[PDB]
């Protein structure tokens, strides 16, 4: 069998992937590209309509002296120019973030206690179902108590709703099934039993507020909007006074005491509230991605679907816009989910571990790290040396470092079943890479990688942390591309090899096992391709309230 | 002394202790017992060894519902607490026989830790207490069981939570009265970001001791904020004395006179009567069947009004044995007194204003919660400069069991560990005695 | 005590409502049982639910303040805290929102009173709330046409009256009998239907309403003409301003 | 002549506005309303399509037992139901916030020094124009240096551009006028001369990043996005090394040293980064509103256009969604800009002041406050007493308190020429209102108003501040509806009466005197009406990249 | 003098106050010292520099003994100088808020 990346390379270039020579400068610059051409014409129309110059191919240096490559979206047969994978140009990657930003998990366990102990009323599946009917009217922005209320247009907010889940099957089956995330239907039996044991008799809401509101406002809006309409529905469904002392317990419960944010707030230099990308820990991101419950027989596929989720969110949207902006970081990210390159390196490492130790059977120590991480690193770098077309494809050193190290780190975690030794292998890969080719990444690429080895196993205040708990706000990780999404993969890798149903939080895992989401979290890379082809229909548009 | 004022000091049973003490003997800047309380709060940490052990056994670390399968560690921490605590103390202390203190509680389940004062003499703020305590206990646990390099990061997670990915110690198994400096609404607010429930827990629900500790913390914060500087210093000292320290037995007496049958309105009548008799207010003008009162000393009127406010809280919420109405008392005591006298209410309207939002945000959908979760750093209740929150402490102290978010729900670890420190549990005794001991040095 | 400045009937009425010595005029008789049905928290005959044990079974700590403040009966028992809430029309209802809150905390013990423009509420221990609620319904605090008992959907204080002179009510909890001139309450305060309506009596006539009201209005007694009341409010504003500065 | 609100009252109700009695309960509930009917049918379709119940008129209490009123957008003849003024349903209100959020002002004064002193190059109007041509290519997301860059689609980012302004008329004439905000053309002559004296020889950029990016990300993205494309345009146009030490001075200049954010970051309880509504001080909001440069002959109109700008932004979007959500606070806000009610009260107060004192000639003391604020308060309250229809229109007390106090406070500031005494009059109005009707606003309406009088003139740390500098993060003001937008109007009022060209920051005033904005900041209320009629065309839609 | 308070390029027309602060620096500094100190022979230090254009202020150690952190230094210094300036020139209640803004800026909105 070939390498998984060969077909991609044969489509990009007319030469064989092994040839060291090509010809440049004859391709027409931007005119070689159907997308650049569309951009040139659009820029002329825009400038004429608004009276200010804009896109102009003659500013600065002339693009396209080399081949402007199409990219294969890995695991698909879709080939697109890279501009179609820019988050601005791809409605699927915008909606994936919106679906995370607009989600919060809110318990009903404290609320039900207030009802029984403080108000002295009964809670049954019938009153729960009535509450859920009420809150699904109210949550998109409609009234239940006051006279002369004005309301949101239901069709503008059709994507907002509330569902529940519980580990108790018999309670789950008595609630109206329209409102229930069925753990037994969404997860394979072994995973469902693990998840149901974690949740037990608790009952949890998954709240999704409207995309149009999330885009007008911010991520920290979500838990507040959620709490307001939970509160109104509790007033209505359980016949409180419309504003008595007990009402306040429900607000505190919904806003603080049993709320699970997707991201925690950030310090002042990068000031942001809850539910922004920098607050989402790597373990949550892996659990948001739903590849684990459909692809559980292939831990490589599960781990790399997480890489793709994270590389997009963390490098393209978060680091490439929230934290910088402009043309951004599309290809720093696409390197990890195009052309089946990372897949080839990581399948090689999984097979090496399978044959030598067996998944999860290697000793969890430095000896395993030095073995697996070195072998996979040398495999990856040799592919760039044997195939000049591959090196021209992933032309930036940063790109290559992230892909090789991801394979080494994931592979090491496959062997030990522990994400922390996987992380040690990531950094070792970087050190070997640097010495082999006398280069690594961009000017500031290996800040965290040089600090890396010593902080994998540190226990000091702002150094020590299991990888699953780390995230974009871990100090060493806060600034640079080509790491965060790959770390999410390394977090997933040992748990996919062990067959674990979740990486860090079982409620987060369950909360995204939902067919009413706009973005399909079971097939992240297929969704990126669909968005690239302009075939994705996002929520939150305003066509209905604007002129033809 | 800068002020001519003197006050008679009483104990929590209404007994005289010392007569005619200079006002500044009660000042946070001068009273050594307040200094002891403030430094004790800065340096005292509670460690939950049972919780650390359970988190490691289940790999449940990093926040609510979080778990890392495959990372479980079975260690017998409670069963080896004496040896762990001793190793931790050697790391925490600066020298042998300094003021370091490490005591085990509940058979090794908890640990009271008081970090040496010397560490705060070369510190900018107060986080050295949790951070030094956390790393000493992490290292001591690792050394006690020879935890491997590969596993030790789970012990760190079990102690300090998701920090530093989170800004807070999210999921931590240590606790302090203070919260992290980033959460301050403004510079100088740290002593105000102590939850009312924590104050009630540390004082074991004794109404006058909870009022005193709360007033000490609030008014000491007003010095750090610069609010009690220059023209305002006397107002804040008089508020501390009369509202929080039962100066001249005024609070105690008002409650005695009104406790069997009284209402908020009847406490107001008695207070106005006493203020007139003591010469604090005088009749300034007569309208039709209505006397307009005036005063030559607004700071003293404020202090008298603030003592009645305390008493009214004690009487109204004590009768209901239910804390929730404190927001109503804080509002309508001040609203009623203004139209009873023609004089301004406590803190020149700011208690009334604080009470308006505090009522709304303790009886509505929009936020807040029950009375015990508020504090002087809360956006809802930060506006009055020390004159509202001590009444909330007193009211929660009197609550018989009407709150879902009670001190037992939010502050159990504080109750069990911080109540052990004498100056935290009975601050009124120590502040008054220290004031007598310095009365002739002021 | 003097309670409030001013020389209008309005000002005097505001004073009377606050004055615990002033005997509220009883205008109607309501049975204890019908009070419970209006409140809607429990059924008559049902035992009072508890949120905590009786105080005698708790053994609470030595505390001179506790010893000195006698609890109300419901607190001794461990009763729930429940509520009654009223809406008062701006067309000369006798009581009005701030008048209520001010008066409750002069008249009643253990009270949590809240004031809003369209609702005014009191929360206290259940059995004590029932005694208070009877006086709030039987006396001049209440007119069955210009006042309403409403735990939710309170709209009306600012609306025009209907052709019978009744205040608007989303949920039509109080019904005027055109053929008899009496108001019946047909639902409890949260809007649930009652088994048997409660007679609330006849609406007060507009002449009597004007004589008893506590709202200032240009077509009654205007606030601007009660200069002694205005003067005191302006004084409080001035003294608050100066106090805040120096 | 009739009061200005009479026409609106006659169109709402069959009765004449003075009548005390009407009939209820026979209008058919929601069926009386065209908009509610649209919502009912949309809710059925949404429920059927997604398989989860949604909007349902039979949940909760039955809306429409009284007349569901239309509202006149003040200064227009447009009548709309209140749901058409909800920010979710009104693309003009969303675009107003986006146009503020995506804007930052960035100096070129430090940047040009670095060029001349550190690099030893020359800066001329010719190099500036070349830089501006480069940055208008780069700013929307297009490349100038590197090979194989992928770029944003120019048509999706057509609303992003960079203009400059300066007080130096000679430099301004040398620069291509497409890039120039011409102070002399946009402002009357007296205002232009004041503004030019403030800016002097400084040269400032107005940067607007794309709406689609602002909606995907947050306000703290704006200054970062701006700085990266300024940096690339400086590299390109002035021939630096593409990444040398001096490149860092430009980044520090554009990100920190000469940047003017529209809002400053917020503390943790309400954690938000820069350029969110809570950080925008009242003085800035008044200066963003452009009524002052078109309606300068009518200081009431200028002031009340500012009230409308702030009431919408601060109450409906900021407090009603960012800090709460759900059905929200439409009518708390519309009370301030519908039915010409506030206009009537405030025109009366302006006539009172002008006749007794003359504008800005009253003594700036408490005597003037007690006079003007009392008289205007009694006038406003009396209108509700004489016109039962008006009282049923503005049915919530909070609404009435905000409108009456705004008239009183603005009028007091018209008299004194000072906003701090205007503020004192706002609070006195509240106290008089509360005693007249024995009610004021909602449960927590007058927290700031009871704190109010003592904090007008305080000088203590977190108490004392001139009103122009206060904003939604001023402690007493941080929580409640019915104040913030009205305070922005009081901030504008004395400056309108004096004829001042700006309230607090001349750079902000100039930066929104720009005809290439999407929202027309010269006619805020007219734009709200256009959005209510579904005739406003926003930026940032994704129709171009989605299926048909 | 310019009413330029509250941040870069900010100005409030009509609020200008013309006070000779530098020319009376010695008296203002003395008044402020009396407010900043705790006792008359503590380690409070207030020294004028550049002929009254600048002041070196060292808040007494005792204030930090009973403080949680370090913000007492700017906050106590700012209010003492605000009050000292108001008292020196008898600045009115109506104008004093501008002295506050000149000393401590846009805080607490920022
Ligand atoms: C449940 C509360 C307590 C609370 O925390 N918020 C509520 C309800 C809440 C809900 C009502 C939505 C629904 O009906 O389902 C919303 C829309 C906030 C949200 N969650 O989106 C709201 N109020 Ni309220 N609320 C308002 C108001 C009011 C006025 C209404 C009095 C009258 O006579 O009608 C009173 C307060 C007072 O009396 O001053 C009021 C109360 C109340 N307000 C009482 C319910 C009153 C009742 O049972 O009818 N608001 C107003 O005064 C006008 C603006 C209106 C806001 C909606 C808009 O701005 O368009 C709405 C703002
Ligand atoms: C008080 C505080 O809520 P919490 O007590 O922290 O839950 C705060 N909310 C608000 O201020 C609600 C403001 C908008 C709704 C009320 C408008 S009157 C906030 O969410 O940060
Ligand atoms: O050249 S640098 O390493 O500074 C930036 C790479 S995008
Ligand atoms: O009724 S409340 O004042 O609590 C809220 C009004 S929206
Ligand atoms: Mg080999
Ligand atoms: Mg699908
Ligand atoms: Mg005695
Ligand atoms: Mg009877
Ligand atoms: Mg246009």
d(CA B370, CA C100): 24
Tokens of A167: 């580990």
Q: HSE (CB half, 13 Å, CA atoms) of E4?
A: 6
D120 and D230 co-located in one domain: yes
d(CA C223, CA C74): 40
Q: HSE (CB half, 13 Å, CA atoms) of C73?
A: 9
D337 is catalytic: no
Q: What is the DSSP letter of D161?
A: E
Of A323, A443, A446, best ligand 3 pocket probe by most atoms within 8 Å of the beta carbon: A443
Q: What is the DSSP letter of A59?
A: S
d(CA D536, CA E57): 58
- Chains near C with 3+ CB pairs less than 8 A apart are A, B, D, E
Measured in angstroms, how far is the CA atom of residue B248 from the centroid of ligand 7? 9
Tokens of A248: 């306040």
Q: Which of D133, D149, D395 sits opposite A63 (nearest CB)?
A: D149
- Phi/psi of residue B55, nearest 5 degrees: -65, -40
- Rg over alpha carbons for chain D, rounded to the nearest Å, is 25
User: Checking DSSP bridges between strand B44-48 and strand B174-175, what pairing results, if any?
Assistant: antiparallel
Q: What share of chain D is helix, strand, coil (3-state, %, to 5)?
A: 55, 5, 40
Cis peptide before E108 (omega within 30 of 0): yes
Q: DSSP states of E26-77 as a string?
A: HHHHHHHHHHH-SSTTSS-EEEEEGGGTEEEEE--HHHHHT-SSSTHHHHHH
D331 and D445 co-located in one domain: yes
Q: DSSP states of D2-32 as a string?
A: --TTHHHHHHH-SS-TT--B---S-S-GGGG
A209 and A346 co-located in one domain: no
Does residue D236 contact residue D247 with C-beta atoms inside 8 Å?
Answer: no
Does residue A219 contact residue A544 with C-beta atoms inside 8 Å?
Answer: no
d(CA D308, CA A143): 25
Tokens of A94: 């915008």
In a domain, A307, yes or no: yes
Q: Is D443 annotated as a binding residue?
A: yes
User: Checking DSSP bridges between strand C147-149 and strand C81-88, what pairing results, if any?
Assistant: antiparallel
Q: Kindly identify the ligand whose nearest atom is closest to the C-alpha of D251.
A: 3
D51 and D166 co-located in one domain: no
Contacts of D444 in chain B (CB under 8 A): 356-357, 359-361, 364
Q: DSSP states of A255-300 as a string?
A: IIISEE-SS--B-GGG-B-SSSGGG--HHHHHHHS-GGGTSTT-HH
A64 and A148 co-located in one domain: no
Helix (H, G, I), strand (E, B) or coil at D474: coil
D323 and D452 co-located in one domain: yes
Does residue B393 contact residue B196 with C-beta atoms inside 8 Å?
Answer: yes
Does residue D456 contact residue D409 with C-beta atoms inside 8 Å?
Answer: no
Q: HSE (CB half, 13 Å, CA atoms) of D198?
A: 27
d(CA A388, CA A392): 6
D332 is catalytic: yes
- Å resolution of this model? 1.9
D130 and D177 co-located in one domain: yes
d(CA A309, CA D105): 35
d(CA D371, CA D365): 10
Looking up tokens 């430099």 gives: D171
D236 and D345 co-located in one domain: no
- Domain extent for E82: 1-110
- Torsional sign, CA D271, D275, D281, D282: negative
Tokens of D542: 């994704």
CA distances from B169 to A461, B50, B136, B197 (A): 10, 18, 16, 20
Interface of B with D in 360-379 (CB under 8 A): 360-361, 363-364, 366, 378-379
d(CA D137, CA D160): 10
d(CA D479, CA B255): 35
Dump strand ranges (E) for C81-216: 81-88, 112-115, 120-125, 147-149, 174-177, 182-187, 193-201
d(CA B245, CA B250): 10
The closest residue, in CA terms, to atom 2 on ligand 2 is B367
D242 and D300 co-located in one domain: no
D355 and D413 co-located in one domain: yes
Give the CATH number of the domain where residue D412 resides: 1.20.840.10
Q: Is B64 exposed, middle or buried, given 0-12, 13-18 or 19+ CB atoms closer than 10 A?
A: middle
Q: Is B143 exposed, middle or buried, given 0-12, 13-18 or 19+ CB atoms closer than 10 A?
A: middle
Q: DSSP states of D51-74 as a string?
A: TS----TTSSS-S-SS---EEEBT
For residue D259, what are the β-bridge partners? D106
Chains B and E lie in contact, requiring 3 or more CB pairs less than 8 Å apart: yes
Note whether C246 contacts E: Cβ–Cβ < 8 A.
yes
Please count the other Cβ atoms lying within 10 Å of the Cβ belonging to residue D78.
Answer: 18
Contacts of B350 in chain D (CB under 8 A): 450-451, 454-455
Tokens of A309: 């989720």
Contacts of D515 (CB under 8 A, 6+ apart): none
Nearest chain C CA: its distance from A242 CA (Å)? 5
Contacts of A243 (CB under 8 A, 6+ apart): A235, B363, B364, B365, C119, C121, D443
Q: Is C32 exposed, middle or buried, given 0-12, 13-18 or 19+ CB atoms closer than 10 A?
A: exposed
Output the ligand 2 site: residues, CB below 6 A: A 224, 255; B 361, 366-368, 379-380; D 269-270, 319, 323-324, 479-481
Q: Do A498 and B70 touch (CB under 8 A)?
A: yes
Tokens of A118: 């403080």
Note whether B67 contacts A: Cβ–Cβ < 8 A.
yes
- Phi/psi of residue A541, nearest 5 degrees: -75, 165
Give the distance from CA B104 to its chain's centroid: 24
Which of D275, D302, D332 terminates a domain? The answer is: D275
Does residue D465 contact residue E10 with C-beta atoms inside 8 Å?
Answer: no
For residue E55, what are the β-bridge partners? E48
B366 is catalytic: yes
Q: What is the DSSP letter of D105?
A: E
Measured in angstroms, how far is the CA atom of residue E41 from the centroid of ligand 4? 55
A141 is catalytic: no
Provide the Cα torsion A409, A411, A413, A414; round to 10°.
Answer: 160
Count, in order, helices (H) and strands (E) of chain E: 4, 2
* Helix ranges restricted to H, D277-340: 282-288, 299-310, 330-334
Q: Do B165 and A469 touch (CB under 8 A)?
A: yes
Q: Which of B152, B162, B365 sits opposite A247 (nearest CB)?
A: B365
Q: Do C241 and E96 touch (CB under 8 A)?
A: no
CA distances from C107 to A111, B228, C70 (A): 35, 37, 16
Q: Give me the number of domains chain A comprises.
A: 3
CA distances from D179 to D127, D134, D211, D519 (A): 13, 12, 20, 19
Does residue E44 contact residue E37 with C-beta atoms inside 8 Å?
Answer: yes
Does residue A368 contact residue A411 with C-beta atoms inside 8 Å?
Answer: no
H or E element that contains A161? strand A161-166
For residue E45, what are the β-bridge partners? E58
Does residue D397 contact residue C117 with C-beta atoms inside 8 Å?
Answer: yes
SS3 labels along chain B: CCCCCEEEEECCCCCEEEEEEEHHHHCCCCCHHHHHHHHHHHHEEEEEHHHHHHHHHHCCCCCCCCCCCCCCCCCCCHHHHHHHHHHHHHHHCCCCCCCCEEEEEHHHCEEEEECCCHHHHCCCCCCHHHHHHHHHHHHHHHHHHCCCCCCHHHHHHHHHCCCCCCCCCCCCCEECCCCCHHHCCCCCCHHHCCCHHHHHHHCCCCHHHHHHHHHHHHHHHHHHCCCCCHHHHHHHHHHHHHHHCCHHHHHHHHHHHHCCCCCHHHHHHHHHHHHHHCCCCEEEEEECCEEEEECCCHHHHHHHHHHHHHHHHHHHHHHHCCHHHHHHHHHHHHHHHHHHHCCCCHHHHHHHHHHHHHHHCCCCCCCCCCHHHCCCCCCCCCCCCCCCHHHHHHHHHCCCCCCCCCHHHHCHHHHHHHCCCHHHHCHHHHHHHHHHHCHHHC
Looking up tokens 């675009």 gives: D95
Contacts of E49 (CB under 8 A, 6+ apart): E55, E56
Please count the other Cβ atoms lying within 10 Å of the Cβ belonging to residue A269.
Answer: 8
Helix (H, G, I), strand (E, B) or coil at C77: helix
Count, in order, helices (H) and strands (E) of chain D: 23, 6
Helix (H, G, I), strand (E, B) or coil at C139: strand
- Phi/psi of residue A375, nearest 5 degrees: -60, -45
Helix (H, G, I), strand (E, B) or coil at A79: strand
d(CA A307, CA A313): 10
d(CA B39, CA B128): 12
CA distances from B43 to B224, C26, D379, D486 (A): 18, 62, 59, 46
Give the CATH number of the domain where residue E22 resides: 3.30.70.470
Q: Which of D38, D52, D225 sits opposite A516 (nearest CB)?
A: D52
Measured in angstroms, how far is the CA atom of residue B14 from the centroid of ligand 7? 6
CA distances from A397 to A317, A402, A440 (A): 21, 9, 5
Does residue A467 contact residue A419 with C-beta atoms inside 8 Å?
Answer: yes
H or E element that contains D162? strand D161-166
A246 and A285 co-located in one domain: no
Contacts of A347 (CB under 8 A, 6+ apart): A4, A300
A39-68 in b/e form (b: 16+ CB < 10 A) is bbebbeebbeeeebbbbbbebbeebbebbb
Helix E72-89 with E25-36: angle, nearest 10 deg: 130
CA distances from B117 to B40, B127, E68 (A): 9, 13, 13
d(CA B105, CA B108): 6
Cis peptide before B164 (omega within 30 of 0): yes
Q: Which atom of ligand 4 is nearest to the CA of B365?
A: 4
Q: Which of A144, A146, A224 sits opposite D325 (nearest CB)?
A: A224
Contacts of B321 in chain C (CB under 8 A): 55, 71, 75, 110
Looking up tokens 């890039």 gives: D179
Does residue D523 contact residue D74 with C-beta atoms inside 8 Å?
Answer: no
Q: Which atom of ligand 4 is nearest to the CA of B360?
A: 4
Residue C116 near ligand 4, beta carbon < 6 Å: yes
Tokens of D412: 């007091």
Which of D249, D275, D301 terminates a domain? The answer is: D275
Does residue D205 contact residue D105 with C-beta atoms inside 8 Å?
Answer: yes
Does residue A329 contact residue A277 with C-beta atoms inside 8 Å?
Answer: no
d(CA D451, CA B352): 7
Q: HSE (CB half, 13 Å, CA atoms) of C91?
A: 25
- Backbone φ/ψ region at D131: left (φ over 0), alpha (ψ -120 to 50), beta: alpha
d(CA D472, CA D304): 19
d(CA A504, CA A490): 13
For residue D71, what are the β-bridge partners? D80
Q: Kindly identify the ligand whose nearest atom is closest to the C-alpha of A526.
A: 6
Give the CATH number of the domain where residue D146 resides: 3.30.70.470
Q: Do D23 and C224 touch (CB under 8 A)?
A: no
Q: Angle B375-B166-E108 (CA atoms, 0-180°, nearest 5)? A: 45
Q: Is B364 exposed, middle or buried, given 0-12, 13-18 or 19+ CB atoms closer than 10 A?
A: buried
Contacts of B260 in chain C (CB under 8 A): 69-70
Chains C and A lie in contact, requiring 3 or more CB pairs less than 8 Å apart: yes
Does residue D467 contact residue D486 with C-beta atoms inside 8 Å?
Answer: no
- Domain extent for D164: 101-275
- Phi/psi of residue A335, nearest 5 degrees: -50, -30
- Torsional sign, CA B183, B184, B185, B187: negative
User: Checking DSSP bridges between strand C112-115 and strand C120-125, what pairing results, if any?
Assistant: antiparallel
Q: Do C106 and B336 touch (CB under 8 A)?
A: yes
Q: Which of E12, E97, E110 sits opposite D459 (nearest CB)?
A: E97
Residue A443 near ligand 3, beta carbon < 6 Å: yes
d(CA A53, CA A39): 14
In a domain, D530, yes or no: no
CA distances from C222 to A283, A392, D308, D385 (A): 67, 87, 31, 10
Q: HSE (CB half, 13 Å, CA atoms) of A128?
A: 26
Q: HSE (CB half, 13 Å, CA atoms) of A5?
A: 30
Contacts of C81 in chain A (CB under 8 A): 245
Residue B69 near ligand 1, beta carbon < 6 Å: no
Give the CATH number of the domain where residue D68 resides: 3.90.390.10
D19 and D140 co-located in one domain: no
Provide the Cα torsion B184, B190, B191, B196; round to 10°.
Answer: 40
Does residue A380 contact residue A407 with C-beta atoms inside 8 Å?
Answer: yes
In a domain, A385, yes or no: yes
CA distances from B176 to B117, B196, B376, E55 (A): 16, 14, 16, 38
Measured in angstroms, how far is the CA atom of residue B363 from the centroid of ligand 4? 9
Looking up tokens 């400086």 gives: D234
Does residue C209 contact residue C92 with C-beta atoms inside 8 Å?
Answer: yes
Which of A100, A131, A147 terminates a domain? The answer is: A100
d(CA D408, CA D394): 17
Please count the other Cβ atoms lying within 10 Å of the Cβ belonging to residue A26.
Answer: 7
In a domain, A185, yes or no: yes
Nearest to A85 by CA among A393, A340, A311: A311
d(CA D331, CA A512): 36
- Rg over alpha carbons for chain A, rounded to the nearest Å, is 25
Interface of D with C in 454-473 (CB under 8 A): 454-459, 463
CA distances from A493 to A93, A429, A500, D246 (A): 23, 17, 10, 43
Q: DSSP states of A479-542 as a string?
A: S-SSSHHHHHHHHHHHHHHHT-S-SS-HHHHHHT--TTSSS-TT-HHHHHHHHHTT----S---
Looking up tokens 């997670």 gives: B157
């Amino acid at each position: 069998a070939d390498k998984l990346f060969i077909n991609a390379l044969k489509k990009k270039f007319e030469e064989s992937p092994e040839e060291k020579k090509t010809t440049f400068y004859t391709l027409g610059g931007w005119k070689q590209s159907e997308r650049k051409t569309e951009f040139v014409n659009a820029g002329k129309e825009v400038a004429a309509k608004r009276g200010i110059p804009q896109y102009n191919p003659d500013i600065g240096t002339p693009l396209g002296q080399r081949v402007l490559m199409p990219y294969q979206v890995s695991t698909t047969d879709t080939y697109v120019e890279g501009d179609d994978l820019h988050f601005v140009n791809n409605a699927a990657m915008q909606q994936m973030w919106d679906d995370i930003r607009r989600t919060v998990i809110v318990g009903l366990n404290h609320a039900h206690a207030v009802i029984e102990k403080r108000l002295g009323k009964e809670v049954t599946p019938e009153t729960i179902t009535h509450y859920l009917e009420t809150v699904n009217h109210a949550m998109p922005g409609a009234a239940v108590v006051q006279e002369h209320m004005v309301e949101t247009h239901p069709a503008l907010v059709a994507d907002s709703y509330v569902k529940v889940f519980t580990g108790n099957d018999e309670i789950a089956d008595e609630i109206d099934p329209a409102f229930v995330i069925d753990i037994n239907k969404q997860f394979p039996e072994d995973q469902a039993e693990t998840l149901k044991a974690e949740v037990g008799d608790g009952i949890w809401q998954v709240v999704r507020i409207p995309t149009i509101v999330s885009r007008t406002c911010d991520g920290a809006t979500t838990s507040r909007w959620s709490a307001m309409q939970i509160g109104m529905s509790m007033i209505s469904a359980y016949k409180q006074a419309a504003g008595e002392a007990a009402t306040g317990d429900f607000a505190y419960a919904a806003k603080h005491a049993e709320v699970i944010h997707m991201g925690t707030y950030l310090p002042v230099r990068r000031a942001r509230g809850e539910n922004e990308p920098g607050g989402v820990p790597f373990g949550y991101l892996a659990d948001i991605c739903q590849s684990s419950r459909v692809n559980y027989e292939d831990p490589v596929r599960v781990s790399l679907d997480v890489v793709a989720t994270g590389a997009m969110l963390y490098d393209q949207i978060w680091l490439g816009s929230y934290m910088s902006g402009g043309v951004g970081f599309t290809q720093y990210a696409t390197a990890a989910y195009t052309d089946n390159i990372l897949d080839d390196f990581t399948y090689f490492g999984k097979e090496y571990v399978e044959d030598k130790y067996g998944l999860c059977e290697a000793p969890n120590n430095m000896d395993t790290v030095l073995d697996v991480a070195t072998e996979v690193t040398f495999y990856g770098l040799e592919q760039y040396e044997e195939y000049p077309a591959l090196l021209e494809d992933q032309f930036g050193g940063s790109q290559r470092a992230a892909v090789v190290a991801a394979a080494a780190g994931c592979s090491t975690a496959f062997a030990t079943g522990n994400a922390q030794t996987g992380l040690s292998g990531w950094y070792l890969s970087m050190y070997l890479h640097k010495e082999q080719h006398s280069r690594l990444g961009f000017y500031g690429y290996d800040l965290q990688d040089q600090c890396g080895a010593s902080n994998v196993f540190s226990i000091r205040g702002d150094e020590g942390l299991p990888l699953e708990l780390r995230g974009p706000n871990y100090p060493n990780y806060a600034m640079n591309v080509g790491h965060q999404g790959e770390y999410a993969g390394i977090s997933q890798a040992p748990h996919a090899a062990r067959g674990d149903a979740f990486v860090f939080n079982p409620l987060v895992k369950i909360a995204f096992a939902d067919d009413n989401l706009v973005f399909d979290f079971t097939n992240v890379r297929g969704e990126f391709a669909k968005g690239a082809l302009r075939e994705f229909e996002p929520a939150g548009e305003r066509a209905l309230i604007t002129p033809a | 002394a800068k002020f001519e004022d003197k006050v008679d000091l009483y104990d929590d049973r209404g007994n005289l202790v010392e007569e005619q003490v200079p006002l500044e003997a009660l000042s946070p800047l001068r009273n050594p017992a307040i200094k002891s309380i403030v430094q004790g709060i800065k340096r005292t940490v509670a460690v939950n060894l049972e919780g650390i052990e359970n988190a490691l056994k289940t790999a449940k670390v990093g926040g609510p519902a979080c778990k890392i399968m495959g990372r479980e560690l079975d260690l017998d921490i409670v069963g080896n607490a004496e040896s762990i605590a001793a190793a931790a103390k050697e790391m925490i202390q600066v020298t042998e026989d300094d003021d370091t203190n490490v005591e085990l509680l509940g058979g090794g389940k908890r640990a009271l830790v008081q970090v040496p004062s010397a560490r705060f003499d070369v510190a900018a703020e107060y986080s050295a207490a949790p951070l030094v305590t956390a790393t000493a206990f992490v290292q001591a646990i690792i050394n006690e069981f020879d935890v491997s390099m590969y596993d030790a990061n789970m012990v760190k997670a079990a102690v300090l939570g998701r920090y530093p990915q989170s800004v807070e110690y999210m999921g931590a198994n240590i606790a302090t009265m203070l919260d992290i400096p980033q959460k301050l609404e403004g510079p100088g607010y740290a002593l105000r970001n102590i939850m009312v429930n924590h104050v009630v827990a540390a004082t074991l629900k004794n109404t006058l001791q909870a009022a005193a500790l709360s007033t000490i913390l609030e008014q000491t914060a007003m010095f750090e904020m610069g609010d009690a500087v220059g023209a305002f210093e006397r107002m804040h000292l008089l508020g501390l004395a009369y509202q929080g320290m039962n100066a001249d037995n005024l609070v105690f007496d008002l409650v005695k006179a009104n406790g069997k049958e009284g209402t908020v309105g009847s406490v107001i009548a008695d207070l106005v009567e006493r203020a007139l008799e003591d010469g604090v207010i005088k009749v300034e003008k007569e309208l039709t069947d209505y006397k307009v009162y005036g005063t030559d000393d607004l700071a003293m009127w404020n202090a008298y009004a603030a003592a009645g406010l305390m008493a009214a809280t004690m009487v109204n919420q004590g009768a209901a044995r239910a804390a929730q109405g404190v927001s109503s008392t804080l509002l309508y005591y001040n609203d009623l007194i203004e139209f009873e006298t023609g004089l301004p209410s406590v803190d020149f309207g700011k208690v009334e204003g604080t009470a308006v939002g505090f009522s709304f945000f303790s009886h509505s959908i929009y936020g807040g919660g029950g009375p015990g979760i508020f504090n002087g750093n809360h956006i809802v209740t930060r506006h009055s400069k020390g004159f509202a929150i001590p009444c909330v402490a007193a009211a929660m102290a009197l609550d018989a069991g009407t709150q879902m978010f009670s001190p037992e729900a939010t502050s159990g670890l504080i109750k069990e560990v911080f109540s052990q420190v004498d100056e935290f549990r009975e601050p009124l005794k120590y502040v008054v005695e220290a004031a007598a001991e310095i009365k002739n040095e002021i | 005590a003097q309670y409030y400045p001013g020389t209008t009937k309005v000002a005097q009425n505001r004073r009377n409502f606050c004055n615990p010595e002033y005997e509220l005029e009883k205008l109607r008789e309501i049975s204890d049982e019908d009070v419970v049905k209006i409140l809607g928290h429990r059924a008559p005959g049902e035992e009072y639910p508890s949120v905590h044990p009786p105080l005698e079974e708790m053994d609470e700590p030595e505390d001179a303040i506790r010893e000195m403040v006698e609890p109300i009966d419901g607190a001794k028992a461990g009763d729930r805290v429940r509520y009654i809430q009223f809406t008062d029309s701006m067309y000369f209802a006798p009581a009005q929102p701030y008048v209520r809150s001010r008066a409750y905390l002069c008249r009643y013990r253990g009270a949590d009173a809240g004031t809003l423009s369209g609702r005014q509420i009191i929360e206290t221990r259940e059995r004590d709330l029932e005694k208070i609620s009877k006086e709030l319904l039987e006396t001049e605090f209440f007119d069955p046409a210009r006042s309403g008992v409403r735990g939710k959907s309170v709209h009306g204080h600012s609306l025009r009256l209907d052709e019978d002179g009744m205040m608007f009510d989303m949920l039509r909890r109080q019904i005027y009998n055109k053929d008899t001139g009496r108001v019946e309450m047909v639902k409890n305060q949260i809007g649930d239907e009652l088994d048997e309506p409660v007679d609330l009596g006849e609406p007060l006539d507009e002449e009597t309403l004007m004589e008893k009201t506590t709202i200032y209005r240009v077509d009654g007694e205007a606030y601007r003409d009660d200069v002694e009341a205005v003067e005191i409010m302006q004084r409080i504003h001035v003294l608050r301003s100066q106090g805040g500065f120096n």
